[PDB]
Amino acid sequence: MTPEIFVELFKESLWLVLIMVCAIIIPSLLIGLVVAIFQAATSINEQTLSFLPRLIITLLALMFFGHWMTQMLMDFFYSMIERLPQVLY
Amino acid sequence: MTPEIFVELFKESLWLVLIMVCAIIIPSLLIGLVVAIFQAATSINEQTLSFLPRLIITLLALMFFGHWMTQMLMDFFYSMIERLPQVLY
Amino acid sequence: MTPEIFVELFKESLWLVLIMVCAIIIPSLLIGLVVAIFQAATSINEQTLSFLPRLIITLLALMFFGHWMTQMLMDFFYSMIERLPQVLY
Amino acid sequence: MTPEIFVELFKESLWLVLIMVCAIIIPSLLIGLVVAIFQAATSINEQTLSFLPRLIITLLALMFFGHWMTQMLMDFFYSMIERLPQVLY
Amino acid sequence: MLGFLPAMVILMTSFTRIVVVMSILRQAMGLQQTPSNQVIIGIALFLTFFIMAPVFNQINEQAVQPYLNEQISARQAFDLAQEPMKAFMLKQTRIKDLETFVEMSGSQVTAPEQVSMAVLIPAFITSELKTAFQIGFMLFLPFLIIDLVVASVLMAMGMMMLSPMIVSLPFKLMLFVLVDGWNLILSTLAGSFAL
Amino acid sequence: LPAMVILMTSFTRIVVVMSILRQAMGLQQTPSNQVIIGIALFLTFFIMAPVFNQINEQAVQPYLNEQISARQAFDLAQEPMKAFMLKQTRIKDLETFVEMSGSQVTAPEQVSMAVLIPAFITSELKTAFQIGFMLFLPFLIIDLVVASVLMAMGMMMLSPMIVSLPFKLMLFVLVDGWNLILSTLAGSFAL
Amino acid sequence: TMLGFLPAMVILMTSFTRIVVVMSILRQAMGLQQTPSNQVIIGIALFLTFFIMAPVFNQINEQAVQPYLNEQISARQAFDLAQEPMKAFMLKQTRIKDLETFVEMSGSQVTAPEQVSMAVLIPAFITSELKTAFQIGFMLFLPFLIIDLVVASVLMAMGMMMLSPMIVSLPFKLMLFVLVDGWNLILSTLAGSFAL
Amino acid sequence: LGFLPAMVILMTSFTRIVVVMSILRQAMGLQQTPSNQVIIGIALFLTFFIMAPVFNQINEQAVQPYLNEQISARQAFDLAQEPMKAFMLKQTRIKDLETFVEMSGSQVTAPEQVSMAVLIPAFITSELKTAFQIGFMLFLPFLIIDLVVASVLMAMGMMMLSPMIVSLPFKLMLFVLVDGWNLILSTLAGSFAL
Amino acid sequence: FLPAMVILMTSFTRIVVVMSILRQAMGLQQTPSNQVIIGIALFLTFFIMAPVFNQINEQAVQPYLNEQISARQAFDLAQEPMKAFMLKQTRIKDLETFVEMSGSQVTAPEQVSMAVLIPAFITSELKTAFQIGFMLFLPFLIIDLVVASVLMAMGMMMLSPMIVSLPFKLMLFVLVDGWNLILSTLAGSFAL
Amino acid sequence: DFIANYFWPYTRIAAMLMVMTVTGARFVPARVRLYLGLALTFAVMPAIPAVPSDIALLSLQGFMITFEQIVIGMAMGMVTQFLVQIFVMLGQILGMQSSLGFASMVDPANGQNTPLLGQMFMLLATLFFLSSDGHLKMIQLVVFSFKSLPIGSGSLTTVDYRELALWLGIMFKASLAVSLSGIIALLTVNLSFGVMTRAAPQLNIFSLGFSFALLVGLLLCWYILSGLYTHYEIYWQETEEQICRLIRLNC
Amino acid sequence: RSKELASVSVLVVGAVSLMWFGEALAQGLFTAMQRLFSLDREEIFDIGKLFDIIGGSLVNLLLPLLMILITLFIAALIGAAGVGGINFSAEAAMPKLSKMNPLSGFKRMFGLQSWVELLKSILKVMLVAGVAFYLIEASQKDLFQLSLDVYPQNIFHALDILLNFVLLISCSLLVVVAIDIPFQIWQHANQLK
């Protein structure tokens, strides 16, 4: 293969990392923003209050997005297995 | 096994993590909220006052919930040991 | 040994952690409360004034409670050494 | 050596930490108190004004106390080097 | 061949599932290689004799006992050795993997007992590392829970430092004794083989 | 020197791909170099079965029933071994190695065996690395996802090499892994 | 073939892995990157092996090897007589609950355990040895965890959040090990655990 | 083959030096800055220096006399066992050795006529104890620096600044102002009281 | 066991320790890949040891190869330039200590044994490795403290001024020309 | 007795192989490299001029000349190791600024480092070294050296060891040239989280700690890969001219 | 009083002053690093002469940093006194137990003020996320151009755009302070009303 093919392949990989990390962390970041807005409004300065909401939401987002995330990784592995013949030559 | 079986198994695991973390940290987060309400009401800005109450309560919640938490982990290990035959084939 | 014996053993350990942390941090938390009451009463908003009193008191409490704390840890180590025969069988 | 000797040795060490931290931070804490009294009296609520005076004074106290602090650490290292024979037996 | 024989007699036996499972276990436990590799490849080698007792007894009766009398050697002895080994391996290769590798080979097989050894062994290993990975993945989860619960209690109290792996190592050592540990895993690694 | 025969075969591509694999998914010193060498040496017996048949039933068995010059066998064994080699080497690597040996441009399948062996091992190293670093890639997503899910909520210290290992094993099992890696490595050789 | 695996089976037939697992769990408990070398751990374990199995080695050399010096019979009395002290050592240290499983998995159940086969006995011995090694290591770990948590809490109470309470707690662990005599207690409960 | 090389390492007083210098490297906060290999090298030369008397004695009693050879596997091996055992016994604590000779159960009237398989276990449990005592003594000034730096930082307000990227130049100052490696590697050699 | 020895008797000890000091100073831990660090320190050692190895070649190797002296006598002669190098890097006190601990003192440092000089050489090489090391740390520590002070005076106090200070450390190390500079102070340090 | 004649060329070749970026790496058993460098000597045997005979292998004159070629080998492949490190440092700059390895930033000691983007860009620099056939040029450079740096006629001069030990500055300059565009974007995000902490001190390392920097550091790493071969082509010319000056070759 | 005007007056000026005082702070830090990297084996083999070098470099560097920090000081001081004045009332600094009464604290904590500062809070993140991400995108081409540039002047051209990004992001909080100023002025009267 040529350099541009492998760069295209790494763009695919970094795009997977990006959309998975987004899917899992966007809910946690949103609830962090919400509870931090609460802290700022009520003038509460308790800098580890945000942990349990963010953790519950990360676990629930791993439960909700877990199936299609594993399907997306499985499809990526398969698509790099069919991509092997053009490596072969 | 199929992908959906292993996803079901990881939901079991993440559910254990969730209920254990909740059982241990909900009391600590509640006492953090209470002492932070105290700070906000008396306008006290001393951002490491919340540590010793939260630590005492986390240790007491590890003492109180320790038995059934270890029983729940033990039952989970056993339930993944009886789940091995359907891996075998 | 059985699970309840090891749970009993971890209650001993968490109790040691609790009483040592309390012995060292209760004086520091008390002086933090006092100096924060001072700040609130004189309406002084200088959020790192509490550090040097709390540090001096933590060092003096490590000097005062250091001997019996090391004796309590030493006795705990010894008591888990005599507790080994009932592990052996 | 016995436990009480090593406890005595740690009291020496914690005493060094205490007097060095005091020597360096007492001037910074005093100027923090003074500038915070200024803020409270003139009703100025600008919570990062205290930084540059406190930093200048910490640097000047590291310049002033630097020599005898390094001499005190050097003498401590030497005194734990002459204390090695009674470790040896 | 002399430089590879110890690695060839291993893959025909039950060594490869047990070593992989036992080495995933110690990564799960967080043990920084406290059972050295020469310890794990000894434990899994004793278990190999224990498991293949029925196979090694048949080999001794059909190959070494006639070898003592020298009835016929180097042609018949090798075949009487391959037969019980082929029976043991063939009872544990997944049908899917056997069919995949036979199709890759291209030869037409009508009797699954009549597959060649050279197509069976590579079809046996891929169905053995898969079982080893499923087993050692299932045995992991009760330890990942402990890691993720300790690493969360610590962070909730506020301690970004204080690596969990040292504070969560006694909990894993406890759990691995309460559940009888090596008596459960080294028994379902022995009841795993239909032999 | 007698093991060089095995490096002439398709042994140097499987060992490298599997050594990339065990390092790709978490495992340190899981299946050890010895186990990987064993499994790859069995996969070569599987893959090179037509070549070993060609050599045996055409240069070895007539040597057992000698009726022939003894060294002549090494002439009849070199032919079917080379035919496997030459369909696997890139043409560019072979041409550069012929320039490097200094000889003039010759037609392929006439190049000496001594020029074909290095042109084969380097072309198998290129292929093994380009296959392994592609299979490496799905196991590098899980490493980067996990280590980003942790570091987002913090924890700073939970090693992403022990929390992502179950996920790597899970993915490698759901794909079935070995039935696609050890199987596409046997259909990786066209002859 | 079976020459690179002998250094892995002779040390499991004996009581060598309990000491190594215990001392490496200890080294991990100190929170201190290794500094005993793996060679040091393996060496003091090998010496404790000659120190513990002496009642068995002093019979292997006495009844099996030195009679093999007069030679009196070749490769028979050794093979079938070195098993006697080894079996009598290992059978005394396997848990009954732990050896019953391997007997029921072997398929051959005998009333007298002394008549059990060696290939059935050695796995049960390893399983009963690693269990006790983990129990001992877990016992000894707890004093080095109370210090971890006390130091981490004292630091975090002050706000000193970036101190890594693993380097500041290293002197306290290094003290607590010397105060309680450390290597004597631990290498004397290890040596005294093989009661026979 | 791999078990034997550690034996001669354990027999000599090589372990004390490595344990002390490695606890020291951990104290200074350097990440393998004195790498492992150079620590083993330093300890090897310090061993060739401390054992220079013992090695001279075995060069005079067991190496040069092996040329006429006079002797084989009966009193030439024990000839080497003797000076090693003398030095070891000079460096083992009585409290340790009386704990292993009581465990073996074989009583000897003279503590010098102890079996080697009981002396070396009693020798390493003293080497490690001494090495931990020395390394603990040495850790303390660096702990004082790590705490003073952390407190000055936390006072000035910069909580989120690691007092390890800023206390390492000071740990390298205090290690040079006191002449450092001259002192420590002198008290290590000065601990093998002969 | 020979490579590590001959490496210790050369300039490798000071160089590789200074490299490992600088790697922590940067904040890019493990990024220059200890294999590369060791390779570069090894290339440097050959550049520093050019005069020393030239002397070893001309004094001992060249007569021995031309059959002008025996083998043992050439081996004895080869140590004279190695010791001539090592004596210059040792300090007087670090040599006096390891001489006094043997009893058999010397009238001049040239008559000292080798197994007495090499311990006195490494203790004086680590000392100067750290003397250069903290002088490397200081420029980076000052960037750290200036970034931290500006970010603190600004407010924030929560940005961890070590992730925002890594690029500044790197830009300023490469902009001041960095390596070449320190290179010319690890070459001038071994002045004969 | 072929080895007595061709041991020195085999030593130069097998010494370059052990360090070279592809063939001399983890993932390749040492026996494969041995039987590779031993097979290369048979192919380039015509392109090797006569070794200095009258010099035995087991002699000081032989050990000197053997080491003087282990040095040439190691010095040739180490330059490709530098070239790959140029890109590993890119990954471990954009990863440590996105807070992906952060325990090793607060604890430059033991700490906890995650070399993930370093491993990814190592995979790049190796697939670029292989795709654009860098290993073939790397072997042509050795085979050209037996006529430019002949066996028994000099070695790397002292001017070459200094020019070769200056490659750490070139690595740190290249890894900054490639990732300057990522550094600016990542600092603009770290400082934006800082302005968030300034305006509202509740947003913390806990509230949204290292969650913006992380997504943006992944997006930047994704955006860098497009124009990342144009830099490899730049630095492979330097890495190739360096070797073409080590073996003078008039290039 | 205002808590955001004092928060933006520090950031705007910590970028603005950072520009021109950093054009020379980088020069001072450059010279210090250059002097500390160069030693000549006489300054090495005696630890009495290195502390002189350290002191000289540090002193040459202290002036630009102090000039940064004094104008940051002044911006912070003038910023908070934007509303009100500098009347020195020594009575407000004497201990009054009525300030920490929980009734008054609860009353000022909730009410309309909490709603308006909750509105500001959800706005303080939208601005810094829609500007720091707009500028990182609208400046995509020029910022990607920094890699393929002549060497000594691409680092300068990158640091001369980082500071403009910072200035824009820190000035975008002007609407946050703009909705705050009349609200604080209105509070100064409704509490009296």
Author numbering:
A (entry chain G), B (entry chain H), C (entry chain I), D (entry chain J): 1 to 89
E (entry chain B): 105 to 299
F (entry chain A): 109 to 299
G (entry chain C): 104 to 299
H (entry chain D): 106 to 299
I (entry chain E): 108 to 299
J (entry chain F): 10 to 260
K (entry chain K): 29 to 221
Quoted from the paper:
Type-three secretion system (T3SS) are multi-megadalton protein complexes that are capable of bridging from the bacterial cytoplasm to the extracellular space. At the core of the secretion system is the highly conserved export apparatus (EA), which is made up of five predicted transmembrane (TM) proteins (SctR, SctS, SctT, SctU and SctV in the vT3SS; FliP, FliQ, FliR, FlhB and FlhA in the fT3SS). Here we present the structure of the TM region of FlhB bound to the FliPQR complex, in addition to the structures of the FliPQR complex from Vibrio mimicus and Pseudomonas savastanoi.
